[PDB]
Design an enzyme around this catalytic site. Sequence first.
Site, PDB file in Angstrom:
ATOM      1  N   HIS A   1       0.805  -1.217   0.000  1.00 26.75           N
ATOM      2  CA  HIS A   1       0.000   0.000   0.000  1.00 26.75           C
ATOM      3  C   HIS A   1       0.840   1.271   0.000  1.00 26.75           C
ATOM      4  O   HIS A   1       0.326   2.339  -0.354  1.00 26.75           O
ATOM      5  CB  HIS A   1      -0.926   0.057   1.220  1.00 26.75           C
TER       6      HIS A   1
ATOM      7  N   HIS B   1      -4.826 -45.730 -29.916  1.00 23.76           N
ATOM      8  CA  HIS B   1      -5.697 -46.008 -31.053  1.00 23.76           C
ATOM      9  C   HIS B   1      -6.433 -47.338 -30.929  1.00 23.76           C
ATOM     10  O   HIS B   1      -7.451 -47.535 -31.606  1.00 23.76           O
ATOM     11  CB  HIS B   1      -4.902 -46.044 -32.367  1.00 23.76           C
TER      12      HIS B   1
HETATM   13  K     K Z   1      -3.899  -6.617   3.319  1.00 24.61           K
HETATM   14 ZN    ZN Z   2       0.578 -40.480 -32.530  1.00 27.96          ZN
END
Ligand code: K
Ligand code: ZN
Length: 755
Positions: free
Chosen positions: A139, A520
């Site tokens: 801050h 696959h």
């Molecule tokens: K804070």
């Molecule tokens: Zn592949």
Amino acid sequence: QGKSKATGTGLVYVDAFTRFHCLWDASHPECPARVSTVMEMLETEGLLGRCVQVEARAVTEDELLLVHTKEYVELMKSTQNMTEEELKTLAEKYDSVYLHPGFFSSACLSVGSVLQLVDKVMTSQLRNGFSINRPPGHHAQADKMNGFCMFNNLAIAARYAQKRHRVQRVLIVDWDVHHGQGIQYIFEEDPSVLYFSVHRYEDGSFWPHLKESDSSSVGSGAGQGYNINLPWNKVGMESGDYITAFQQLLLPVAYEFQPQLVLVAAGFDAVIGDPKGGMQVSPECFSILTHMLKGVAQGRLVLALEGGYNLQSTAEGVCASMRSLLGDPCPHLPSSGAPCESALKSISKTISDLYPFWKSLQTFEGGPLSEVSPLPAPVCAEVKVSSPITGLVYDQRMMLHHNMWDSHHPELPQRISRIFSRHEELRLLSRCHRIPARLATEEELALCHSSKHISIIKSSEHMKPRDLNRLGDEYNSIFISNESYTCALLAAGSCFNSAQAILTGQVRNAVAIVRPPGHHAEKDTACGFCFFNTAALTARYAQSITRESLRVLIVDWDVHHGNGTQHIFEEDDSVLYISLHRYEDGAFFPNSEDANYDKVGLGKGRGYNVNIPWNGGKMGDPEYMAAFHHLVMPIAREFAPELVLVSAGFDAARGDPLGGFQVTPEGYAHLTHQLMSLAAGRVLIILEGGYNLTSISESMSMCTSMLLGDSPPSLDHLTPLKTSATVSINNVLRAHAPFWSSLRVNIPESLRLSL
Ligand SMILES: [K+]
Ligand SMILES: [Zn+2]
Ligand SMILES: [K+]
Ligand SMILES: [K+]
Ligand SMILES: [K+]
């Protein structure tokens, strides 16, 4: 490399941080007990002894003047000699501030502690660090105190990094529940520093009550675009809200910014139980957020304590962050991996306000996404955190599968020997735990494959060559040898042994250097160089040794779509399949429209099958990373897997003869790093495709390097993206947003079309 590698985590704490306190209010929330409770817990948890002790130093005048004014510094210096009445009289002049004769001394050590860690990290003595410092900083402003802050620790540290360590770009991330408006002001017109602050706002009703805390303040002058506010406008936010904001907004921007240092305003007033934040983030979340930030800036990460006013909650937040700095595996998220509507609004609003300036944010087409009630977003039972052991499994017998009629077929035996050699060169092999290989049983194969298909391939141990040539032609793109069955048994059983080691806690993550591939292979046929779907089988094996409902995520980054994997789980909500793959509007292998984006699964499994299809160009790291930021990780997080399997096809790699894509070994590292925050770190990487022996040996070694905890590598520019990739990404967003709330960025088409 090796012995000289930067691995340690620096911790700065000095008793001086307790020497100042509020003189007129013994109940003030910014008090000595904050840091001493953090230190007490760090020791109780055994984390303190794991950090490298780094000494604090007093910040110098010229260091302060990187940010502050000589008039202000001298005023603050003069407080040393004031009476309590003078100190109170001066403190009144500032918003939410107290003073104490030791305040200035400790403030100088608070700033200097960050500089020390920046020194240690930029000189590559340490990997990262965390200062347990007070007073806070974010801050404080050039000429005034604010919000319990005297000097802006991280802002000074950012410019110090640039001046003394010749860093160009610094990223400051501010997850403290308050807006660090001091940092925003200091770097307002400075594009060398990018400031992101996520904070409570509720339309300015929450302190500091500033219009400029809103997402509309994007910076000005040369700094326009480089200031980002994410204001929460309802209280009660949880981890899923922060984590989605990091996925959809901060990480794309940060990866585009390519910083060389990340400073974190690590306040923990967002945590359960904090009396000022009003949020409900569980400390575990900051293990995730820390891990995410290790991706940018090659892990050069320094945290400094800001706010956090419940003593236990703050200490728990520090411990959760420190564990990630120390490289411990991420926790299972206690809350759900799903954002709320008010978070998605704030996120989308902030994306919209910053959309002109960031080509990563411009991945979004815009227009309305679904708001239907999403799929369940469950939470996983706690797994106890431990030192991470990476398992590795490889056996030379998987080389014996081969193509006698075409010596030049790409699924070469040497794929796995070259990968294993590169692990042995880079000393990764000696760092991993060697899981033994074993054969899958027919029983275990029956978890996904029909007894017909099993018995067919089982006979191949005896089928003669000419029969093997006929049999191969009954399948799409298959070749067979008398060892092909035994190799496919090891490619499965080795992943079973790995999954068993992960789920029994013998290791935490693992890599499986196996062939032939599997993704696959179907219920009832071989296809695409695959016989048995070892990825799918391993998921079922995991469910068999734990419980039938164990959630498993299968990520398939092979350039091919794993049709067989999609089908085995197309009706299943216990397994989530995500695939990235080349498709070319259906032209590319496996030439089936199953691989398109609109194939979201069927039945109770609707939503549990994600296809990311690539068309129209060479795809690489930029597209695969954006796909992860915006699709893979949001969906995976919301699914909340208990185990992650990766169909790791390195045929998307640069220089692959089949894929035609240009993913780099560095990209694969970051894809792996992303996934390591899922499933409490329980990731198993299984080799699929990828046929350039050089690129795959490098890519998979990088994946294992990440599993072992090494810092993420540098990257090429991750913007701009190919436009067909942008389109296909948004197609998946629209397809899957009805199922997964983490996807629901709602930015209007007006902004896309106004550029
Ligand atoms: K804070
Ligand atoms: Zn592949
Ligand atoms: K903040
Ligand atoms: K800035
Ligand atoms: K794939």
